[PDB]
Design a protein around this nucleic acid. Structure first.
Ligand SMILES: [Cl-]
Ligand SMILES: [Cl-]
Ligand SMILES: [Cl-]
Ligand SMILES: [Cl-]
Ligand SMILES: [Cl-]
Ligand SMILES: [Cl-]
Ligand SMILES: [Cl-]
Ligand SMILES: [K+]
Ligand SMILES: [K+]
Ligand SMILES: [Mg+2]
Ligand SMILES: [Mg+2]
Ligand SMILES: [Mg+2]
Ligand SMILES: [Mg+2]
Ligand SMILES: [Mg+2]
Ligand SMILES: [Mg+2]
Ligand SMILES: [Mg+2]
Ligand SMILES: [Mg+2]
Ligand SMILES: [Mg+2]
Ligand SMILES: [Mg+2]
Ligand SMILES: [Mg+2]
Ligand SMILES: [Mg+2]
Ligand SMILES: [Mg+2]
Ligand SMILES: [Mg+2]
Ligand SMILES: [Mg+2]
Ligand SMILES: [Mg+2]
Ligand SMILES: [Mg+2]
Ligand SMILES: [Mg+2]
Ligand SMILES: [Mg+2]
Ligand SMILES: [Mg+2]
Ligand SMILES: [Mg+2]
Ligand code: NA
Ligand code: NA
Ligand code: NA
Ligand code: NA
Ligand code: NA
Ligand code: NA
Ligand code: NA
Ligand code: NA
Ligand code: NA
Ligand code: NA
Ligand code: NA
Ligand code: NA
Ligand code: NA
Ligand code: NA
Ligand code: NA
Ligand code: NA
Ligand code: NA
Ligand code: NA
Ligand SMILES: [Sr+2]
Ligand SMILES: [Sr+2]
Ligand SMILES: [Sr+2]
Ligand SMILES: [Sr+2]
Ligand SMILES: [Sr+2]
Ligand SMILES: [Sr+2]
Ligand SMILES: [Sr+2]
Ligand SMILES: [Sr+2]
Ligand SMILES: [Sr+2]
Ligand SMILES: [Sr+2]
Ligand SMILES: [Sr+2]
Ligand SMILES: [Sr+2]
Ligand SMILES: [Sr+2]
Ligand SMILES: [Sr+2]
Ligand SMILES: [Sr+2]
Ligand SMILES: [Sr+2]
Ligand SMILES: [Sr+2]
Ligand SMILES: [Sr+2]
Ligand SMILES: [Sr+2]
Ligand SMILES: [Sr+2]
Ligand SMILES: [Sr+2]
Ligand SMILES: [Sr+2]
Ligand SMILES: [Sr+2]
Ligand SMILES: [Sr+2]
Ligand SMILES: [Sr+2]
Ligand SMILES: [Sr+2]
Lengths: 132, 337, 160, 142, 172
RNA sequence: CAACC
RNA sequence: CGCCACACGGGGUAAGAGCUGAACGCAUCUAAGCUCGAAACCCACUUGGAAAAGAGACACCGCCGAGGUCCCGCGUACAAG
RNA sequence: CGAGUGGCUUGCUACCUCGAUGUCGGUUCCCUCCAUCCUGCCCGUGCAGAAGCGGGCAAGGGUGAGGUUGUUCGCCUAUUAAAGGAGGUCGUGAGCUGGGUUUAGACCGUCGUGAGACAGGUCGGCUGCUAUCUACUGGGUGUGUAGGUGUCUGACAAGA
RNA sequence: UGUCCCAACGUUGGGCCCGGUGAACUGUACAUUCCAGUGCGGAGUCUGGAGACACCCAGGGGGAAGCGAAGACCCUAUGGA
RNA sequence: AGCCUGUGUACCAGGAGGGGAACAACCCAGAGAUAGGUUAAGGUCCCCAAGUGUGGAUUAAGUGUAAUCCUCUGAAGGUGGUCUCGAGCCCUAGACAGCCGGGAGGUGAGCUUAGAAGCAGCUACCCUCUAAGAAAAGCGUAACAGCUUACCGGCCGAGGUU
C-alpha cells in the first residue's frame, strides 16, 4: 500500500473488539483478519492504524449483527510515530466499515480520524468531521 | 501438523565467542575508483542525541520537510598514519613485504609498541618500487593509530593501532600518495576521507553481556502456559533427535553473548564538525563532555560508550550520496531524565 | 492384481477341473479372427508373435493383447478384411490368491492363465503382401500388453 | 621455503592419479619428492561429472569435519595422501617428505615420469586441476 | 582420411599449433580446430585436414573442419552478410547502433531499452527499417544477427498477435 | 492410535 | 512494544531460446565449437580462523636487559580463569 | 492390459530385545528428502488480453492464525504469494504435557446361572535419578611450532 | 487478567568463587570421536574413510538401545492363591 | 520374506589357517611342534606382496573397476550413440541428395450444382506434343489464382539405398 506517512505499533489483534465509528448501524466490531498480512508461527495476527481489516459485527442493529464486512482502522490507543518524532495516540480503538472500493458504507463518521488514514482512504476522509 | 518456522538466530555470526581484538578489523575494503586515498578512519563512541533534518531524499513525498533523526555522537580526532606497509602477491595469497616508517611519533605511541630508533625508509621504499616493477605488488596499506589523549572522556592514553588500506588511482600514484602522508607525520582527519552525507560502514565490538541463556542469546521461546511451571522456564525442548546420536552445533545453547565484532553497513554520516554543538546537558551519561572533532552517525553504532569504532567508505551502498544534509536542530537536552 | 504375482512358472500344474471348483470364466472373446471360413494356406504371408521368455499369461492379458491387435487389423483392413489371425494358446493353469495369516493359506480360486515357453508362437496371422505392415503393427501393440519381450517373426514371406 | 627434494616431478599435462601413485611409491622408498606445476596436472573424463564429484566432497561435512581442499595444491596432495598409510609412522614420514607446488619454485625443471603423460592432440575429454579449483571457488592465485 | 583444400589466390592462411589464421582483402579470422587425432596444416597452397582414424565421430569433425575453413576463405574475400527487417505494429521501434552494441527502444512501448553487444569486428548498418550485419567471421556475424532477433523475443504473450521485433530477412 | 477379545 | 542497518554487479550452468556445423553434398541448437539463460551453483558481503605439523608473513625493540609478573586504583570486561 | 520405483499406510514373518529400548496426540528444538504448494526461469494451449489449464528446470527461502474434536486425519472460517507432502526409534517423556490410552474405585448398555467380560461408552485416578564417559555450546591452563612488542596473512569453517 | 501475542525489568533463597565438614548412586575391560557399511537385522570398540595436541571450568541433557526394579502386559508350567 | 513346512547332500553348530573391505556355514583349505621350499583360492597402479606385462578389439557412460548374496538391482518399452558381420536392389549409359531449368495442350474432363475449374461428392481416368509432364500425391481459394510431389533435362561426381 501507499506509504502511511508514520510508523505504527499495531495495537490490535485478531479477535479484538473495537468501536465502529460510523452510522452504519454497527456499534462494536470484532477483528477477524488483516488485509495483506502474513505472520509467523504462534503469532496472533496484528492490525493497527491505517490497515484494512475484515470484521464481524458483534453489537449493533439486527440486520448488521453477525455480518462479515471490511473496515479501516481509524483510531487506536497504542501510540504511532510521526516524521517529526512526536507520538500520537487516541482515546479508543475504532474502525469504519468500507466496501469493495474502500468507500465508507455509512453516511457519517463519528469522532476524530488520523490524518495518515486520509492519504490512504480519501473517500473515507471526505466523510470525516475531525482529522488530527 | 507442526507448522514451519525459521530457526532461532543466525548461523552467520559464529562461533558466538569473545572477540580477540577489541579494536575492530575490517575484512574487506572499498573498490579502487576515485583519486588515491586512505579508505578508513576511527573514533570513540560518546553517546546519542537527535537532530532535526530537512528531508534530502529526492524521491520522498516529504522532500524538503522537517524530520527528526536519531544520531550517535562519535569523537573523531586526528589520527596518524605512521607507516606504509606493502603486500606482495604470492602463490599462497598476500603477504607483508616491507614497511616504510617515519621519525615523528606521538609522545605516547610507546605505550603500545617499541618505536623504531633505527630505520631505512629509502631501502624499504626501494624494495617496494622494485616489487612494483616486477608486478608482484599487492594492495598498499597504512599502519594507523589513534590519539586517545585528545579525547578527555576516554581514560586510555595507550593508542589503538590498525592497518587501513589505501585505494585510488593507479598503484604508482597511490603508492606516492601513501608515502607523502606517512612522511609528514601521518596526521590526517575525518574530513580528509569522508564528507557529510556519504555512507560509511561502521565496525565495532558489541557491548558485552557475559553468559546468557538461549532465550536472550538466540531468541528461542520461553516455555509456555503449563510448560512454564513444572521446573523448566527458559530451557529449550530438546538438544536434538535420537539420531544423529550427538548434539549439533546448530542447536541454540547458552554461552558468551556480546563483545563480538560487528560491521554495520550503510550508516549515513549526518555531519562532521568540531566543538561542542552535539554535547548534551549534564554530559553524556557514563562518558563525559564533547568539545573537539566529532562525527554524527545516523542511528546506532555497535559498542558501549568509549569503545573504538572504525569507519570505512560503504562497500555496498544502496543509495546515492546526498551531500551535506541541512541540520536545523541538534538536541542538547540532558540525557538524564 | 499385478502380473508379478503370477507371471512365473513357480508352481505345480494346476488344471484338473474334477478337483477344482469355482473357476472364473475366461475373458478371451475369440481365438480365431478375420475370415475364419478361409484357410491359412490361401495366404502368401504368415507372421507370428514369438515370446522370448517362459511365462504365464493371465486370460485378462490375452484378451487385451488379442483385442488391441485384432482391433487394429479391423481398423486398417475393415470388419471383413482379407486376413485371419489366431491366438493358439488357452489359459489352462488355474490361479489362486490367499486373501487368518499364513494359517490354512491355500488360496481361493481367482483366475486362469496360459503357460508359454520361450520361443513359442502366441499369435499367428495370415495376410496378403499388402497388409503385411498392418499385421506387424497389430503385433507391436499386442506385445505391449503381455509380460515378456517378443519377436515379430515373418514366416512365408520373401517379398522384401 | 627450501625443500631438498631428491626428485622434482613435473605434473604438466600428466594424469594426476598416475603421478600420485608413483610419488607415493618413491616416498615410501625414502625419496623426497616435489611435485611441480600442480595447477596444470590433468584428470581425464567429462568435466561435468568430474566437477560434480569434487563439489560433493566440498559440500560433505559436519561438526566432526571433512575438510576437503579446493586449491590444486591441496587437491593433489590429498590425492597422494590417499595412496599412503598416513596414519602409520612410516606412512606419515613418507607423506611428509612430499610437497606439491603451484608453478615451479625451483630453478631446475621437473622430470616427466613415464606413463603419466597425456597427449593433448589425442584427447579432448579431460580437465585441469586449475580449472577444477576455479569451479570449486578457489581464488586463482596461480 | 585426408582432405586437401586449395586456398584462394585472394587469400593466404598461416597456422601454428591448433590455431589457424586466414587473411584476405576483407580481413582475418583465427580459429582453433582441436579434435582427437585430426591434424590440420598448411601445406604450400593448400590446407590439409587428416587423421589415421576413420570412425563416424572422426569423419564428422573432419567434415566440420572443412566447412569451417571454407567459410573462413569466403569471409576474408566476399565476406558474410545477413539482412534484417525491423517490424512493429503499434509502438514505433527505435533501432540504433551505439558503441559496440545495437540498442532498441520503445519495443512494445517499453520504457527500458533492450540491447546486445556486437561480436567480433562485425559491422551493423541500419538504413530505415533495414539492417545489414556483415563481417569476415561467419560465427561472430551470424551470432550478432541472431542476437538482435533474440533481443526482441517474447514469451509472455501470443506471438501471432504481438509480432513486433527485428527478423533475419536474408541469410548468406 | 496408544495388547489381550 | 521503541530506533538503526541488512545490494547492485560479476562468473559458470539447468530447463529452455539460438548460432556455426558435420556424420548424411541437403537438413539438423550437438556429435567437436559457440552466444545466451533460474530465487538455484561460484564470487561479491558478514563472522571465526597460526595447532594450516609446509605449525605462516612484516616492522621494530631487546639479549643485561626489551618485555613481563607480583603489587596498587579501577571497569568499555567478567560465574573461576 | 503390461513394466517398475518407494518404504509414508496396511498385511505377513517371528530375525533382535521380556534380569523392561516407556506406548497416542500435542508441544519445544535441530538436521534432512523431493514425488514442488508459493517464490525464480522456461515449454505448450481448445495461448488476443487478463486469467486459467497442462508440462519442464529448480529444495535458496517461505508455507502462517483460528472454531468442534484427546484426536492423527478431517470438516469449517477469515486472511495469504502459498498457507505442499515426507524421513530423522511413526526424531524429540535421564525435555515438557497427561486430554486419550493403560491397573486398583464406580456407573450404563450388551453378554454371562454366577464370579465376571467388552481397542463399547462414562466420572476419578502416581511421571523416580546429585551426568562417569561421549556429544555439543561457551570459558580457561599447558605443551608444540622456538627473547619481546605491534600489525597482518588465509588454508579451512559458518550464513538465508 | 502476562494463559497467550512476546517477552522485559526487578526481589529473596540457591547457583559461581573461598574456609571447614563431607556422603551416595554407579564401575567386565578398553575408551578423543564422526560418517557410512557390516554384524543375532538398533556398533565409541568389527571394516573403510574422515576427524583428532593434553588437561581443566561452567552448562543444557543428543547418545551410552544411560541408572534404578530377574516385564506388572503376552504366552509357557500336568505352578500358587 | 533374512517366511512356513518336507527331502537328499555337504557344511556351521563342534572347524583352525589363506581369500572374500568387515562378514557361523561363498572360495581355497581340514590342523602336532619347529624350520626351508612350492603352490591353492585370490591377486600383481598406490594403500598392500606381485605387471603401470604382451598381442588385439570395444566402451566415453566414471558405463565399469560388484563370482555367490537380506547385502551386488535395474524392467516393460525405446535408441541414425558407436563398432562388427550378412542379404536384396540401384550406379561413370552418372546412382542418392542438393541446386538450376522444364513441368505443356485437348480441357476450366463428364456428372451433381447458381458455382466447383487436380484436389465437396459420384463416375470415368482416356491422347497430342515430347527429353518430360496425373482426367493430379499434399497445402492453398467463396470458386479461380498461387506454391509444390510426381515425371524430364542440366550442373556435380562415387558410392548409394533397403
Ligand atoms: Cl487471520
Ligand atoms: Cl513450551
Ligand atoms: Cl565439514
Ligand atoms: Cl594409515
Ligand atoms: Cl577425448
Ligand atoms: Cl578333519
Ligand atoms: Cl570418478
Ligand atoms: K492386558
Ligand atoms: K520385551
Ligand atoms: Mg501453535
Ligand atoms: Mg535517559
Ligand atoms: Mg525526555
Ligand atoms: Mg524370535
Ligand atoms: Mg532406558
Ligand atoms: Mg524434480
Ligand atoms: Mg496468459
Ligand atoms: Mg534447505
Ligand atoms: Mg516417535
Ligand atoms: Mg529422550
Ligand atoms: Mg518420564
Ligand atoms: Mg531427571
Ligand atoms: Mg476426560
Ligand atoms: Mg478418562
Ligand atoms: Mg481393554
Ligand atoms: Mg523374569
Ligand atoms: Mg495378568
Ligand atoms: Mg488355583
Ligand atoms: Mg552347539
Ligand atoms: Mg608393492
Ligand atoms: Mg555406478
Ligand atoms: Na520439576
Ligand atoms: Na528417547
Ligand atoms: Na484362526
Ligand atoms: Na579419471
Ligand atoms: Na567438505
Ligand atoms: Na548467472
Ligand atoms: Na518396490
Ligand atoms: Na508424542
Ligand atoms: Na526450495
Ligand atoms: Na482444528
Ligand atoms: Na522408541
Ligand atoms: Na514423563
Ligand atoms: Na509423548
Ligand atoms: Na508475570
Ligand atoms: Na545426555
Ligand atoms: Na565338519
Ligand atoms: Na581378513
Ligand atoms: Na563409477
Ligand atoms: Sr516432528
Ligand atoms: Sr584491520
Ligand atoms: Sr576474513
Ligand atoms: Sr510436573
Ligand atoms: Sr545412534
Ligand atoms: Sr513356489
Ligand atoms: Sr512386453
Ligand atoms: Sr610400483
Ligand atoms: Sr542447451
Ligand atoms: Sr604457530
Ligand atoms: Sr536388557
Ligand atoms: Sr531432483
Ligand atoms: Sr510458479
Ligand atoms: Sr476424524
Ligand atoms: Sr501416527
Ligand atoms: Sr487421564
Ligand atoms: Sr474413544
Ligand atoms: Sr472397560
Ligand atoms: Sr611431540
Ligand atoms: Sr577404525
Ligand atoms: Sr547440570
Ligand atoms: Sr598395463
Ligand atoms: Sr591392449
Ligand atoms: Sr541387512
Ligand atoms: Sr544379482
Ligand atoms: Sr530394456
Amino acid at each position: 500500500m501507499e506509504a502511511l506517512g508514520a510508523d505504527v505499533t499495531q495495537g490490535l489483534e485478531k479477535g479484538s473488539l473495537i468501536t465502529c465509528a460510523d452510522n452504519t448501524g454497527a456499534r462494536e466490531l470484532k477483528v477477524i483478519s488483516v488485509h495483506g498480512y502474513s505472520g509467523t508461527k504462534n503469532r496472533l495476527p496484528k492490525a493497527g492504524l491505517g490497515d484494512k481489516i475484515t470484521v464481524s459485527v458483534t453489537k449493533g442493529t439486527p440486520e448488521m449483527r453477525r455480518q462479515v464486512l471490511e473496515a479501516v482502522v481509524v483510531r487506536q490507543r497504542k501510540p504511532i510515530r510521526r516524521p517529526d518524532g512526536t507520538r500520537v495516540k487516541f482515546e479508543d480503538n475504532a474502525a469504519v466499515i468500507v466496501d469493495e472500493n474502500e468507500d465508507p458504507r455509512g453516511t457519517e463518521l463519528k469522532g476524530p480520524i488520523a490524518r495518515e488514514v486520509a492519504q490512504r482512504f480519501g473517500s473515507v476522509a471526505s466523510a470525516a468531521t475531525m482529522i488530527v | 501438523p507442526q507448522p514451519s518456522r525459521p530457526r532461532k538466530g543466525s548461523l552467520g555470526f559464529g562461533p558466538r565467542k569473545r572477540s580477540t581484538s577489541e579494536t575492530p578489523r575490517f575484512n574487506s575494503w572499498p573498490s579502487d575508483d576515485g583519486q588515491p586515498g586512505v579508505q578508513g578512519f576511527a573514533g570513540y563512541k560518546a553517546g546519542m542525541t537527535h537532530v532535526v533534518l530537512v528531508n534530502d531524499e529526492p524521491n520522498s513525498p516529504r522532500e524538503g520537510m522537517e524530520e527528526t533523526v536519531p544520531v550517535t555522537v562519535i569523537e573523531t580526532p586526528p589520527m596518524r598514519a605512521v607507516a606504509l606497509r606493502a603486500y606482495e602477491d604470492t602463490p599462497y595469497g598476500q603477504r607483508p613485504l616491507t614497511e616504510v616508517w617515519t621519525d615523528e611519533f606521538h609522545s605516547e605511541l610507546d605505550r603500545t609498541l617499541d618505536v623504531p630508533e633505527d630505520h631505512d625508509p629509502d631501502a624499504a621504499e626501494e624494495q617496494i618500487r622494485d616489487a612494483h616493477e616486477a608486478g608482484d605488488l599487492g594492495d598498499l596499506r597504512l599502519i594507523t593509530h589513534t590519539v586517545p589523549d585528545a579525547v578527555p572522556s576516554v581514560p586510555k592514553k595507550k593508542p589503538d593501532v590498525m592497518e587501513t588500506r589505501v585505494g585510488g588511482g593507479s598503484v604508482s600514484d597511490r603508492l606516492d600518495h601513501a608515502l607523502d602522508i606517512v612522511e609528514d607525520g601521518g596526521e590526517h582527519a575525518m574530513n580528509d576521507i569522508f564528507r557529510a552525507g556519504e555512507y560509511a560502514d561502521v565496525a565495532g565490538v558489541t557491548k558485552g553481556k557475559g553468559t546468557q541463556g538461549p532465550v536472550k542469546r538466540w531468541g528461542v521461546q520461553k516455555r509456555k502456559g503449563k510448560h512454564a511451571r513444572q521446573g523448566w522456564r527458559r530451557r529449550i525442548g530438546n538438544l536434538g533427535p535420537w539420531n544423529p546420536s550427538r548434539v549439533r552445533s546448530t542447536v541454540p545453547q547458552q554461552g558468551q553473548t556480546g563483545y563480538h565484532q560487528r560491521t554495520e553497513l550503510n550508516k549515513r554520516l549526518i555531519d562532521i564538525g568540531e566543538g561542542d554543538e552535539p554535547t548534551v546537558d549534564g554530559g553524556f551519561v557514563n562518558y563525559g563532555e564533547v568539545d573537539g572533532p566529532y562525527t554524527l552517525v545516523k542511528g546506532s553504532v555497535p559498542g558501549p560508550d568509549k569503545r573504538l569504532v572504525r569507519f570505512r567508505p560503504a562497500v555496498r551502498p544502496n543509495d546515492q550520496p546526498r551531500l551535506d544534509p541541512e541540520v536545523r536542530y541538534v538536541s542538547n537536552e540532558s540525557n538524564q531524565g | 492384481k499385478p502380473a508379478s504375482m503370477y507371471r512365473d512358472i513357480d508352481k505345480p500344474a494346476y488344471t484338473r477341473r474334477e478337483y477344482i471348483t469355482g473357476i472364473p470364466g475366461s475373458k478371451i472373446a475369440q481365438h480365431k479372427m478375420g475370415r475364419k471360413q478361409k484357410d491359412a494356406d490361401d495366404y502368401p504371408v504368415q507372421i507370428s508373435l514369438i515370446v522370448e521368455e517362459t511365462v504365464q499369461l493371465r486370460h485378462g492379458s490375452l484378451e487385451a493383447s488379442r483385442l488391441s491387435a485384432n482391433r487394429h487389423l479391423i481398423k486398417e483392413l475393415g470388419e471383413e478384411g482379407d486376413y485371419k489371425m489366431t491366438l493358439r494358446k488357452f489359459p489352462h493353469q488355474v490361479l489362486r490368491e490367499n486373501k487368518d495369516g499364513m494359517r490354512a493359506a491355500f488360496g481361493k480360486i481367482v483366475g486362469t492363465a496360459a503357460r508359454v515357453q520361450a520361443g513359442e508362437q502366441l499369435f499367428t496371422a495370415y495376410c496378403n503382401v499388402e497388409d503385411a505392415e498392418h499385421v506387424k503393427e497389430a503385433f507391436r501393440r499386442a506385445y505391449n500388453k503381455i509380460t515378456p519381450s517378443c519377436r515379430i517373426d515373418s514366416s512365408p514371406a520373401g517379398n522384401a | 621455503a627450501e625443500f631438498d627434494a631428491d626428485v622434482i616431478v613435473d605434473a604438466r599435462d600428466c594424469i594426476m592419479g598416475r603421478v600420485a601413485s608413483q610419488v607415493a611409491e618413491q616416498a615410501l622408498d625414502g625419496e623426497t619428492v616435489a611435485v611441480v606445476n600442480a595447477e596444470r596436472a590433468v584428470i581425464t573424463g567429462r568435466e561435468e561429472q568430474i566437477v560434480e564429484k569434487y563439489e560433493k566432497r566440498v559440500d560433505i561435512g559436519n561438526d566432526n569435519g571433512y575438510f576437503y581442499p579446493k586449491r590444486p595444491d591441496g587437491i593433489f596432495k590429498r590425492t597422494i595422501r590417499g595412496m599412503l598409510p598416513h596414519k602409520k609412522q612410516r606412512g606419515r614420514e613418507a607423506f611428509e617428505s612430499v610437497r606439491v607446488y603451484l608453478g615451479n619454485p625451483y630453478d631446475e625443471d621437473g622430470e616427466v615420469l613415464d606413463g603419466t603423460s597425456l597427449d593433448r592432440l589425442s584427447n579432448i575429454k579431460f580437465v585441469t586441476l586449475g580449472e577444477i579449483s576455479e569451479t570449486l571457488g578457489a581464488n586463482k592465485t596461480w | 582420411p585426408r582432405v586437401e583444400l586449395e586456398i584462394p589466390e585472394d587469400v593466404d592462411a598461416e597456422q601454428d599449433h591448433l590455431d589457424i589464421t586466414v587473411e584476405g582483402d576483407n580481413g582475418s579470422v583465427t580459429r582453433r580446430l582441436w579434435y582427437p587425432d585430426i591434424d590440420v596444416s598448411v601445406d604450400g597452397d593448400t590446407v590439409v585436414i587428416e587423421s589415421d582414424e576413420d570412425n563416424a565421430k572422426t569423419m564428422s569433425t573432419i567434415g566440420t573442419f572443412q566447412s569451417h575453413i571454407e567459410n573462413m576463405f569466403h569471409g576474408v574475400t566476399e565476406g558474410w552478410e545477413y539482412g534484417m527487417e525491423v517490424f512493429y505494429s503499434h509502438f514505433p521501434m527505435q533501432v540504433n547502433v551505439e558503441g559496440d552494441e545495437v540498442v532498441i527502444e520503445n519495443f512494445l512501448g517499453e520504457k527500458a531499452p533492450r540491447r546486445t553487444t556486437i561480436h567480433g569486428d562485425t559491422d551493423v548498418e541500419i538504413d530505415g527499417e533495414e539492417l545489414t550485419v556483415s563481417g569476415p567471421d561467419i560465427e561472430a556475424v551470424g551470432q550478432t544477427a541472431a542476437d538482435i532477433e533474440q533481443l526482441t523475443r517474447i514469451n509472455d504473450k501470443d506471438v501471432r498477435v504481438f509480432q513486433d521485433g527485428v527478423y533475419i530477412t536474408r541469410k548468406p
